Amino acid sequence: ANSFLEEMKKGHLERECMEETCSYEEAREVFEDSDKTNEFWNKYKDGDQCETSPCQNQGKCKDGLGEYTCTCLEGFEGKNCELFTRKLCRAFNGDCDQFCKRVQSSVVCSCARGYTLADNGKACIPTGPYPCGKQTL
Amino acid sequence: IVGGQECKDGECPWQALLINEENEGFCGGTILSEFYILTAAHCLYQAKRFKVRVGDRNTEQEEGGEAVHEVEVVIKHNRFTKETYDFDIAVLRLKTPITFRMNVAPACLPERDWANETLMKQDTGIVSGFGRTHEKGRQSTRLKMLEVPYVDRHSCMLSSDFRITQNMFCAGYDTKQEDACQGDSGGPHVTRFKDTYFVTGIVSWGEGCARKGKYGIYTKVTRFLKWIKRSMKT
Amino acid sequence: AQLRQFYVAAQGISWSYRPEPTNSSLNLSVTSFKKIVYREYEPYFKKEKPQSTISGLLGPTLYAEVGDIIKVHFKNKADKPLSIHPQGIRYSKLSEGASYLDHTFPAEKMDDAVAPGREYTYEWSISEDSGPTHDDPPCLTHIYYSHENLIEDFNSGLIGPLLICKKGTLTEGGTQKTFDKQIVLLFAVFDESKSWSQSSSLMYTVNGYVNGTMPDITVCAHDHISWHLLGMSSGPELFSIHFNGQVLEQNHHKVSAITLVSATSTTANMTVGPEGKWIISSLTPKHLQAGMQAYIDIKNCPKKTRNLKKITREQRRHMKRWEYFIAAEEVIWDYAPVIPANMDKKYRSQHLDNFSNQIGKHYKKVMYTQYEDESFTKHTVNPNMKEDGILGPIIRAQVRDTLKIVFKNMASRPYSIYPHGVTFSPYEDEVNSSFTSGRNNTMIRAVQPGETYTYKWNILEFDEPTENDAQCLTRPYYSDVDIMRDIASGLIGLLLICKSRSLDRRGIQRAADIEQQAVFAVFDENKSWYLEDNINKFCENPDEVKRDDPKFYESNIMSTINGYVPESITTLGFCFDDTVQWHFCSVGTQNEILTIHFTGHSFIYGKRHEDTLTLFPMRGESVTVTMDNVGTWMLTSMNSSPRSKKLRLKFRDVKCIPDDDEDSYEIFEP
Amino acid sequence: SNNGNRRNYYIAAEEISWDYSEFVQRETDIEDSDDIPEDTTYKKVVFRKYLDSTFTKRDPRGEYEEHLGILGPIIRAEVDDVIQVRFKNLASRPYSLHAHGLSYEKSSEGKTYEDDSPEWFKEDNAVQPNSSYTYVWHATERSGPESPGSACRAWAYYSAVNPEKDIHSGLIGPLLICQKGILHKDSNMPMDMREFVLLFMTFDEKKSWYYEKKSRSSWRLTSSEMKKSHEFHAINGMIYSLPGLKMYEQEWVRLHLLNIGGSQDIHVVHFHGQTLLENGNKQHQLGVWPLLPGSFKTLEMKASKPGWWLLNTEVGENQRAGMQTPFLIMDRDCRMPMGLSTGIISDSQIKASEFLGYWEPRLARLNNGGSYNAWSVEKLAAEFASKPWIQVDMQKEVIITGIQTQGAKHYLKSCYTTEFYVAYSSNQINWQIFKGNSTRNVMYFNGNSDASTIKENQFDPPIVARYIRISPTRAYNRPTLRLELQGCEVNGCSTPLGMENGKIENKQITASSFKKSWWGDYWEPFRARLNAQGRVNAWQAKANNNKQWLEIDLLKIKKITAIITQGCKSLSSEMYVKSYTIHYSEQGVEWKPYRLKSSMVDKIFEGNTNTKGHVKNFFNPPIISRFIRVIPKTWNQSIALRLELFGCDIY
C-alpha cells in the first residue's frame, strides 16, 4: 500500500486504523474531534480495560494509555471504589456548607435558623432575603 | 481600631452603632435578627440612656443609610462585673423591627459543638467598630475593620496580667500595633466559613491598645448561645 | 590561630579506688587494681604536672577556643595499645584515634593504636562549627577516652574531660576570665571485671573515687562558677547530677537536677549560695546505693564585687509571704481503696492481695499534709485530695517571694523537706545552739517524732525560670536524710517555682485553667523505713517471711502514679478547650527512664510540641495540655517491663455541658 | 486551615523474612569470626507501601528508603493536612496503626483499651487478619515543627494491638510532619534537606509473635551468650553495617533519631568526626546526642570531612554488639567524572543488551565525535519487557552521585533518549534499579530535548556500585546514548587539591625547567592545570632527562590519596609522559623516592597512556607531606604533565 495519493482522499476509519497501523495524526482527520479520537486512541494501544468494568460502585471508567480510572460517587472513592468511606466531617467539613452533627458514622450536614438543607444533604439555602451572615450586595 | 482597614460599602452590614443622648457613637453592636442587637455588657454604663443606629458608615454625616432605632428591652448577664469583665454580654431588643437592607444584615449563631470544634480552631477572626485609631486617641467617625488572628488559650493567658476566664478568648498580636481600641466595645468578633460569617465573640476589654506584647480580648459567644437564644425569646 | 601543647602519658598506676595518696602515713590495706590512667606532664616530658587531690583518674582537662588548635602529646607508658579520642571534635583520620574498618592506610592507622613507648601528637583544629553557639554556655564540655577497646580499655580508666570554649573566655591558667571558679566532676562507671586487670568488681566512682571518699572541693560564696560534668560507662546508664542546696543553669534552663547518660558531658553556669558544705550526689537510685556522692566546701572569700542586682519597691508588693503549714503523719496509705473487677486477677494476687505472708496493698507510710495555720489543726481542703493522691501540697511561689514553709514532723522518725529551687542557707537558724563534732550529721536538724520547724525559703533571682521555661517549674521536694530510704516512704511533692506575677491573690496559677499533677512515684516499700512495720502489722504469720524472696521483695515495688496504682485510680475528666497543666516528675526506685504517651493529645514542652515525655529520676518536667479533641483517651508508659507497662492513665476529653447561665438574666428598659 | 491535601497512603503488613546481618557478611573478607551471631535469619511482618488501593502492584523501596531496613514506609504530611492511610493486614495476625502527635478521631487511633466506646467505629482498634480499614489522620499545628526551629518533625507509627511485641515483630515506621510548603504535591517527599530516619532500637526476638521457640529439652549447660544472641542492637534493624547513609561534605543532614526502644535502650547517638546541632529557638552545639526511649529528635549535623566514619551509640556494650554502622561522608565536590569522558574506563569495560550497527557500547564516551559516537539501538524494546541496556564496569566499589546524557544524529535526524532509567549492581548478578524520589516504581529520568545538549540527573542518594546499567524507555526516532557517570571514591579524602579549579595558587607550582614556544610562550609550572585548554597549558622541562621534577607546595601538610595525570597536544604531535615516579618532603629538601611497602626500589608509575586519558594512580602508602615532586622516568618524543592531586588536609 502507501500509494502516492493516499493522503488526498478523505479519511475513513477502516482505511486508516483497521486496515493499517494508524498514528495519532491520521486518526484525528477522520473524526475531526479531539475528544472522540482520544477515546479511540487509548483503546488502540492497550485494549479496553473498561469492557469488564473492573471498578465498583458504578465507577465512570475511563480508558487511557496504559491505565484505567473510574470517578465514583459519594461514599465510595479510590481507583477500585470497592471500599466505603469514613464520613469524618473533620476533613473539608464533610463536604457540607455548615455545621455537622455526628450521629453514627454518617456525616450530617445541618443548617440553622434562616437556612434550609439542600436536596443533596450537604448545602444550605437561606429561607428568605438577607439571611444571617452575608454581605449586602 | 488600631490600624486595620475601613469597612467598605456593604462590607460590614452586621455592625450596629450605639449613640448616646448626644447621638455620639460610643459602642458597637451586632444584628442577631429583625429585633435584636448584640452588644457588650459594660457599654450600658457609659451613657445610661442610648439609641441604636444601624447602617452608618460615618457617625459625623448623614448619607441616607443611618437608621436610629429605639430600644425596647435591655437584657444583660447578672454575673457580669467590671472587676473581671467576665460574662460581658448584653442583647438589646428594639422597639421597632430592623429593616434589613444595603449595609444592614444580621449575623448567624452557629451550633455550640461545631463552633467550638471548628470555628474556635480557625486562623483569623474579624473585628470592627468605631474605636480609637491609637491608644488615648479619638474615636474615628468612620467604621474600620481588623483581622484579629486567634490565639491558643494557653498562649494568650501568659501575656495578659489579668486572668482570662473560660468565657473569654484573646485575638491580636503579642507585638504588633493591631487591636481594637476604646470605642469598639460591643462590636462583633465574627468567624468566616465558606463566605458565611458566624458570630464568635464580643469585644470585652483589653489592656492598652495594640501594645507590643499584647493581644485584644474578646468574650466567647459560644458560651452563651443557649442564653442568647433564650434572651432572643424576650 | 593560637596553638597549644598538652602532655598526656598513659601511665597505669597501682590504684585503690579509695584515696591512696590521702593517707595518714599508714598502709590502709591494699585492695588495689592495676588501672591505666592519663596523667599530665611538664612540657617535652621532662617531668609531671602534679594533679589535684580530686582529679583521680581524670586526665588533663583540655581547653581550646574557636580557631585555636590543640596539639596533645601522647606516648603510652603501659603495656597495651591505647589512643585518645574526644567527643565533639571534627578531627581527621590522621588524629582520630579510633580503630575500625575505615579503609585507612597504616599511616593513618597510627592514631588507631599507640604501641607502648611510641609517640604521636594529635592536632585538633577547632573551627567555628565545633565552638559554642550564641545560646550555649562559654566552655562546652566533652569527654575523651581511648578508642582501641571501647569496653575493656575505659574500665581501666583512660578517661579525661575536654572543654572547648568560646572565642575569648580563657586565660593561660586553665580557667575562664568571666568565671571566678571552675570544677570538672566525673560520674563514671568502672567495671573491674571488664578492666584489663579482669578482677571481679564493679565500681561507680566520683572523679575516679569510690563510695564518696573523694576529697572535698573549695569554692567561694556567690562565686560565678562554670561546672563541667562527665558521664561515662560501657553499659547503659542514667546519671542525674544534683547539687544539693544549689540551683544550676543547663543551657539557660534553670534545672536543679542535671541528668546525663553514658559517655556524655555537660556545662552549667552556676552561682554559689552562702558559705556552707553540701553533699552532691547523682539521684538515680542505682547510683544512690552506689555512692556517687561527692562534696563541696564554700569558703567565705572576701570578695564583694556583686551581692545584689536591682531590687526595687514595685516588686516588694509582689513579695507575698506565702505561709504553707506542712506536716508528716504516719498512717496507712492504700494504692487501691477500690479496684475494678475487670482488672488483671493474676497481678492482684501477688502485689495487691493480702496473702498470708505477702502484705499486698495496704502499707504504713508518711505523707505531706497541708494546713492553714500554725496549729496544724485543720487540713487544707483541696479539690483533688483523692485525684492527686499522696503527692505533697503544691508549694507555689514566685521570684522574690519570701515563703514561710512551716514544716511539721508528726511522724515516727526524723525527716526533712529539701526543695529543688531554693539555695537555702544553713547558717540562718543557729544562734546559741550547741553542736557536737562528728556524729550523724543530718543536713537538717533531726526533727524528732513530734517536732516542728519553720523553714524560711527564698526564691532569689538565681532561681527564676528563664525565658525558655514554663511559667511554673516543677521541682520536687523531699526529706534529705536519705534520698533512698525517704522518697520510698512517699515524702515527695512538687514546688511550683513560678515567675513574677504568675499567681493570683489566693495563690493559684494565673495561666492554667486546671492544674494537674502526674508524678510516677515508683515506690519500694522494702526501701522504706516502714518495711518491717509494713509486714509485721499486716502479716498473719510473720515468722515465715524472707526479704530475699523475689515473690516477696519484688512483690513490694508498687509502681504508681501520684500514689495510686493506675489500675486502681479514677478516670480523669477535663472540659473541652481547657489548658490542663501537667506536672511530671519521676521518683522512687525507678532505675530506668519512664517515657509516657498522650493518646490523641499533645502538650507544649519548651516552645515545642511533644507527645512522648521522657523522665529521669527526681527531675521534674511541666507541660500544659489543651483538651482539643473529643473522646476518651489514655496516658500510658511505653516501656516494655511489666512494672513499667501497668502505668496506664485514662482521661476523657469530654464536651463541657452547661454551664447553667441560661437561668440567670435581668430585664430592664432604658 | 482547610485548603490542604488529602494525603492518600496504603500500608500493608506483609510477611517477609528478615536477617539483620545480611549486610555484614556481604563484606566478609577478614580472618575474624568472633563478632557475629550464627543463624540470624528470622521470620517477621513489616509495613510495606503499596501504590494501588487494591494491594496488587507494590511500591518498591528505592534508594532514599534503602537505609530504612525493617521500618515501614515513610508517611508525610504538612501541617493542617489530612492523611488517609489504608491498612491491608497481609499477615496471619491482627494488626493496626498507631500515631504520635497527629490529630485523629477515635476512628483512627488504632489502640485498643478500656475507653468505653461504641463499636460502630472501633474497627480501627484492632484490625482483624485478612481485612482492611482506613485511618484518617490530620496534622494540626500541635504536630508540626517549631516556629522558628527545624524544618520537619519526627513521629513513629506502628501496629497498636500489642506494641511491646508488635514492634519486635517488625511493625514500625517513620511519620514525618513538616512545615507548610516543604513536602511535594505528588511525591510526598521533602525538598530542602537530606533526612535520615534512624531507629536506634533493640530487636529482642524472644518477644516477637514469630518467635520459633522450639523444644530446648536437649541442650547443653547455658553459655550465657545465647541469651543475648537473639537481641540485635541495630540501627534500622541492620547490625554492624547499614547501607544508604551517604551524605556530602559540609552539608546539613536532618537526622530524625527515632527510638521506640524499651526501658533500657539508652542510646547516645554519636557520629565520629561530627558535631550535632539541636536546631530550634535556642540552637545548641553537641558532639553526641543522648537519645532516650520514646524520643523522636530532629537534629541537624554538619558534615566535617569525607571518609568512612562510624555512626554509633557510645555505650560500650552496644559497640561490639553491633550498633555501629559505618556511615559514609563523601567529599563536597563528589562530582568527579568516573572516566567515560576521559578514558579511565576503556572499551573493554562497556557491554550492552543490544546495539545497532557500529553504535557499540564503546561509543559511550561523553561528548564523543565522529560518524558513530554513541550507544544506539534501532528499535527500543518497549514492546518487550526487557528494554535495551548499556553497562559499564568500574572494577571497584565507587560512588556515583549523578549522570550526564546526550545523543547523536545521522547528519539529519536528531535521535536521543527523551527518557531512561538506571540499574546498578556490584556483583553483576544481584541487580537493583534506581528509584530516587519518583512517584512510580522507578525514576524514569528526564531525557534530553536535543541530542547534543546535556541533561544532568543527580543520583540522590548516591549509588555505591561497580556496575551501572542504563535502559532507555523513550526516544525520538531512535535511542542514542552518551554518558559520563559522576562521583568519587568510597574512601574519602579524594577531592582534587585544586590544580584545576585554581584553589592551589599558580606560584605554588615550581618547575625544574621548562621550554619556549615557537613565538615566545613558556610551559611554566603554574600552567600545569588539569584539563587546561590552550596552545601552551602544560608543564614541561627544558631538558629531557631523569633529573626533572615538578615541585608544587601545598602550604599545608595534606594527605594525598591519589593522583591523575594528563598529556598535551602539540601542533603536529602528541606530547605526554610514559612513566614517572613521585617524590615528596615534609620540608621541601629531603626528597624521598616513592617505594612499595615491601620494595626498596622506587615505584616507577606508569605515565600517560595517551594525551587526554586520565592515568589515575593511587598511593599505598599515601603521601603525608606538604611538598611533592613528580619525577618523570619515560616520555614520548617530549615531556608534558598536567597532573592533579586528590587528597585532604590535616585537622
Ligand SMILES: *[C@@H]1O[C@H](CO)[C@@H](O[C@@H]2O[C@H](CO)[C@@H](O[C@@H]3O[C@H](CO[C@H]4O[C@H](CO[C@H]5O[C@H](CO)[C@@H](O)[C@H](O)[C@@H]5O)[C@@H](O)[C@H](O)[C@@H]4O)[C@@H](O)[C@H](O[C@H]4O[C@H](CO[C@H]5O[C@H](CO)[C@@H](O)[C@H](O)[C@@H]5O)[C@@H](O)[C@H](O)[C@@H]4O)[C@@H]3O)[C@H](O)[C@H]2NC(C)=O)[C@H](O)[C@H]1NC(C)=O
Ligand atoms: C560502694 O559501697 C556500696 C555499699 O555501700 C557498694 O554497693 C554495691 O555496688 C555494687 C557495684 O559495685 C553492686 O553490685 C551488684 O552485683 C551484682 C552483679 O554481679 C552479679 O552478676 C554478675 C553478672 O552480671 C552482669 O551484669 C551486671 C549488671 O550490674 C554487672 O555488674 C556484672 O559485671 C555482669 O556484667 C556475675 O558475674 C556476678 O558474680 C554477680 O552474680 C548484682 O547483684 C547487682 O545488680 C543486679 O541486682 C540488682 C538487684 O537484683 C534484684 O533486682 C533485679 C532487677 O533487675 C532482678 O533481676 C534480680 O533478680 C533481683 O531481684 C539490680 O538492681 C541490678 O539492676 C542488677 O540486676 C549489682 O550490680 C551491689 O549491689 C551494691 N551493693 C548494695 C548493697 O547496694 C559498692 O560495692 C561500693 N562501690 C561502688 C559502687 O563503686
Ligand SMILES: *[C@@H]1O[C@H](CO[C@@H]2O[C@@H](C)[C@@H](O)[C@@H](O)[C@@H]2O)[C@@H](O[C@@H]2O[C@H](CO)[C@@H](O[C@@H]3O[C@H](CO[C@H]4O[C@H](CO)[C@@H](O)[C@H](O)[C@@H]4O)[C@@H](O)[C@H](O[C@H]4O[C@H](CO)[C@@H](O)[C@H](O)[C@@H]4O)[C@@H]3O)[C@H](O)[C@H]2NC(C)=O)[C@H](O)[C@H]1NC(C)=O
Ligand atoms: C551563664 O548563666 C547566666 C545566668 O545563670 C547564672 O547562673 C545561674 C545558675 C543563676 O545563678 C543565675 O542567676 C546566674 O546569673 C547568664 O546570664 C546572666 O544573667 C544574670 C542575671 O540576669 C546577669 O546579671 C546582670 O546582667 C546585666 C548585664 O547583662 C547584660 O547582658 C545580658 C546578656 O547575657 C542581657 O540579658 C542583659 O539584659 C544585659 O544587657 C546587668 O543588669 C547586671 O550588672 C549590673 O548592672 C547594673 C550596674 O551596671 C546594676 O543593675 C547592677 O549592679 C548589676 O549587677 C548583672 O550582671 C548576667 O550579666 C548574665 N551573665 C553575663 C555573662 O552577662 C549568662 O549569660 C550565661 N552565659 C552565657 C555565655 O550565656
Ligand SMILES: *[C@@H]1O[C@H](CO)[C@@H](O[C@@H]2O[C@H](CO)[C@@H](O[C@@H]3O[C@H](CO[C@H]4O[C@H](CO)[C@@H](O)[C@H](O)[C@@H]4O)[C@@H](O)[C@H](O[C@H]4O[C@H](CO)[C@@H](O)[C@H](O)[C@@H]4O)[C@@H]3O)[C@H](O)[C@H]2NC(C)=O)[C@H](O)[C@H]1NC(C)=O
Ligand atoms: C526529586 O529530587 C530531585 C533532585 O534529584 C528534585 O529536583 C528539584 O528540581 C526542582 C525543579 O524541578 C527544584 O525546585 C526549585 O529549585 C530552586 C531551589 O532554590 C532554593 O534553594 C536555593 C539554594 O539555597 C535558595 O537560595 C532559594 O531561596 C530556594 O530556597 C528554586 O527555584 C525553588 O525553591 C522554591 O521552594 C523553596 C522552598 O520553599 C523556596 O525557598 C523558594 O523560594 C521557592 O519557592 C524550587 O525548590 C529543586 O531545587 C530540585 N532539587 C534539588 C535538590 O536541587 C525534585 O523536585 C524531586 N521531585 C519530587 C520530590 O517529586
Ligand SMILES: *C[C@@](*)(O)[C@H](CCCNC(N)=[NH2+])NC(=O)CNC(=O)[C@@H](N)CCC(=O)O
Ligand atoms: C468598653 C469598650 O469600649 C472597651 C474597649 C476595649 C477593647 N480592647 C481591645 N484590646 N481591643 N473596653 C474597655 O473600655 C474595657 N476596659 C479596659 O480596656 C481597661 N482595662 C483599660 C482601658 C484603657 O486602657 O483605655
Ligand SMILES: *[C@@H]1O[C@H](CO[C@@H]2O[C@@H](C)[C@@H](O)[C@@H](O)[C@@H]2O)[C@@H](O)[C@H](O)[C@H]1NC(C)=O
Ligand atoms: C486470609 O488469607 C489467608 C490466606 O490468604 C489467601 O490468599 C492470599 C493471596 C490473599 O488473597 C488472602 O486474602 C487469601 O485469603 C487465609 O488462610 C486466612 O484464613 C484469611 N484470614 C481470615 C481472617 O479470613
Ligand SMILES: [Ca+2]
Ligand atoms: Ca451617620
Ligand SMILES: [Ca+2]
Ligand atoms: Ca580504623
Ligand SMILES: [Cu+2]
Ligand atoms: Cu563513638
Ligand code: NA
Ligand atoms: Na504584642
